Amino acid sequence: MEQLTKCEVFQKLKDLKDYGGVSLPEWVCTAFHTSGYDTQAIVQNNDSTEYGLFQINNKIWCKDDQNPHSRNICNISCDKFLDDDLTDDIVCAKKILDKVGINYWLAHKALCSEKLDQWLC
Amino acid sequence: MEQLTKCEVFQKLKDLKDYGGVSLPEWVCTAFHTSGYDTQAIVQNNDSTEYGLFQINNKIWCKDDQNPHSRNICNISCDKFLDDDLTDDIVCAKKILDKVGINYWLAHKALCSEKLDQWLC
Ligand SMILES: [Ca+2]
Ligand SMILES: [Ca+2]
């Protein structure tokens, strides 16, 4: 487990700023609600496993031992989303947004719409 | 010989979209350079024969009369890649990509990297 600080997340996610119209504060809020800022977070379900800060699944986005038959859209091994370098996690998160949108993370709940200045550092 | 149209190929290959990070236009471009869209294309070498749209060889991927000792990774008879139903060809192409990558088809040449919108239908 390696839980980052809100300010650290804000800094590291600088590259996602306004990507797809999503402001930095919104990306920090999404991260807080997805993994609590833990870059090594791993959550398992009956049929899948989600990895890292962005909880990217091994069913469609990355490939791991549990499911070598994953669509592997991000063309990468899921364990790469468990380290300190968020560079590749960001490259993949951009694809998820582009393809499925912010609901991949927010699930139709408006959790990152009001008082967005609270997520600023 | 049954040469498809670019638009037909685009439609039939819908299932490969973003598989392994390969966009649909890239898959259409690969097909054009591999077989000219001919689903019955057969190309022979001194030691092997390649079949169909994806020119799958009977040395490692499928099994035919010429080489019953093929690794048969796709566990199928090569003639199955000579008909109209690209369903099984796609299942096998996914394996080739997963195992060897796009160079199985492109051979280290960047033929499907620029102006990819030209392959759209
Ligand atoms: Ca990483
Ligand atoms: Ca077939």
Side-chain angles (χ1 to χ4, degrees):
Chain A
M1 162 192 264
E2 213 208 337
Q3 298 167 261
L4 281 177
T5 230
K6 178 177 89 185
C7 275
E8 294 180 285
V9 176
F10 189 85
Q11 184 45 45
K12 312 197 129 97
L13 301 197
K14 230 72 202 239
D15 241 338
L16 283 168
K17 194 171 122 104
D18 292 331
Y19 183 83
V22 184
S23 58
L24 206 35
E26 278 170 280
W27 281 114
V28 175
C29 171
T30 301
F32 167 80
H33 284 108
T34 307
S35 63
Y37 303 148
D38 188 352
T39 51
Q40 288 174 8
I42 290 183
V43 175
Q44 304 166 316
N45 301 290
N46 280 345
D47 52 309
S48 61
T49 301
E50 302 130 275
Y51 299 78
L53 190 73
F54 293 111
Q55 286 293 275
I56 296 166
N57 79 221
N58 68 355
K59 205 143 199 108
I60 299 289
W61 310 97
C62 57
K63 192 148 61 153
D64 65 354
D65 289 331
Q66 173 183 39
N67 194 2
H69 189 216
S70 147
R71 239 211 137 56
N72 198 10
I73 289 188
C74 288
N75 183 31
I76 188 173
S77 64
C78 303
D79 67 286
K80 243 65 255 149
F81 300 140
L82 294 182
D83 59 23
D84 308 14
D85 196 349
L86 303 181
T87 299
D88 42 23
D89 307 44
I90 283 174
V91 166
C92 188
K94 281 184 185 177
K95 285 184 215 301
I96 289 168
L97 185 77
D98 281 345
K99 309 184 176 313
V100 195
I102 207 89
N103 271 328
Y104 170 85
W105 297 287
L106 306 191
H108 313 274
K109 272 147 189 25
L111 293 170
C112 302
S113 30
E114 346 190 304
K115 306 273 173 132
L116 287 177
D117 53 301
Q118 78 183 289
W119 308 105
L120 294 172
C121 169
Chain B
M1 162 192 264
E2 213 208 337
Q3 298 167 261
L4 281 177
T5 230
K6 178 177 89 185
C7 275
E8 294 180 285
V9 176
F10 189 85
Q11 184 45 45
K12 312 197 129 97
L13 301 197
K14 230 72 202 239
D15 241 338
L16 283 168
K17 194 171 122 104
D18 292 331
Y19 183 83
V22 184
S23 58
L24 206 35
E26 278 170 280
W27 281 114
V28 175
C29 171
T30 301
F32 167 80
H33 284 108
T34 307
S35 63
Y37 303 148
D38 188 352
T39 51
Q40 288 174 8
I42 290 183
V43 175
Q44 304 166 316
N45 301 290
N46 280 345
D47 52 309
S48 61
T49 301
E50 302 130 275
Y51 299 78
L53 190 73
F54 293 111
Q55 286 293 275
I56 296 166
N57 79 221
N58 68 355
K59 205 143 199 108
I60 299 289
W61 310 97
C62 57
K63 192 148 61 153
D64 65 354
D65 289 331
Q66 173 183 39
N67 194 2
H69 189 216
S70 147
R71 239 211 137 56
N72 198 10
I73 289 188
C74 288
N75 183 31
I76 188 173
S77 64
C78 303
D79 67 286
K80 243 65 255 149
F81 300 140
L82 294 182
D83 59 23
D84 308 14
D85 196 349
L86 303 181
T87 299
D88 42 23
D89 307 44
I90 283 174
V91 166
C92 188
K94 281 184 185 177
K95 285 184 215 301
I96 289 168
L97 185 77
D98 281 345
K99 309 184 176 313
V100 195
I102 207 89
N103 271 328
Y104 170 85
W105 297 287
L106 306 191
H108 313 274
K109 272 147 189 25
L111 293 170
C112 302
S113 30
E114 346 190 304
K115 306 273 173 132
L116 287 177
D117 53 301
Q118 78 183 289
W119 308 105
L120 294 172
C121 169

